[PDB]
Amino acid sequence: MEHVAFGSEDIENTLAKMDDGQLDGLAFGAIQLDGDGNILQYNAAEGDITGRDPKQVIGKNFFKDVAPCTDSPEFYGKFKEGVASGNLNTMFEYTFDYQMTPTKVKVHMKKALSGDSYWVFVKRV
């Protein structure tokens, strides 16, 4: 497995070297979102929670079509503020209920080492 703990401070440095496959060995959900909310990466872990297909939701809008349940001031609002601000590192509990059993999860959002890329790590709680 890809040994890298959830919530690690230097996670974007460690993760900035993993291809898709490399990214599928993680013990938690990982999503790469561009500046507009377009899915750049989607690993198998999150798929296992949301039931979506990693290869299927690539290139689609996450807040608009993939995960509308995150279209709120509590998810989206924080994201845009971060996008616009140029930075963001925030941890929070949340519930994904769209097209699925309500699953009490925890979300960690942080800007990547790259320019306009943002990470959205998720785990069961």
Ligand X SMILES: *C(=O)/C=C\c1ccc(O)cc1
Q: Which residues contact ligand X (rule: CB under 6 A)?
A: 46, 50, 52, 66-67, 69-70, 96-98
Name the residue nearer to ligand X (CB basis): 13 or 24: 24
Residue 17 CB, nearest approach to ligand X (Å): 23
Find all residues with CB under 8 Å of 123, minimum gap 6, and list them: 6, 28, 29, 105, 106
H-type alpha helices, the chain? 11-15, 20-23, 44-50, 76-85
Residue 7 CB, nearest approach to ligand X (Å): 19
Residue nearest to ligand X (CB): 69
Name the residue nearer to ligand X (CB basis): 92 or 98: 98
8 A C-beta contact, residue 83 and residue 77: no
Residue 88 CB, nearest approach to ligand X (Å): 18
Residue with tokens 């519930």: 95
Name the residue nearer to ligand X (CB basis): 15 or 31: 31
Q: Which residues pair with 26 in a beta bridge?
A: 2
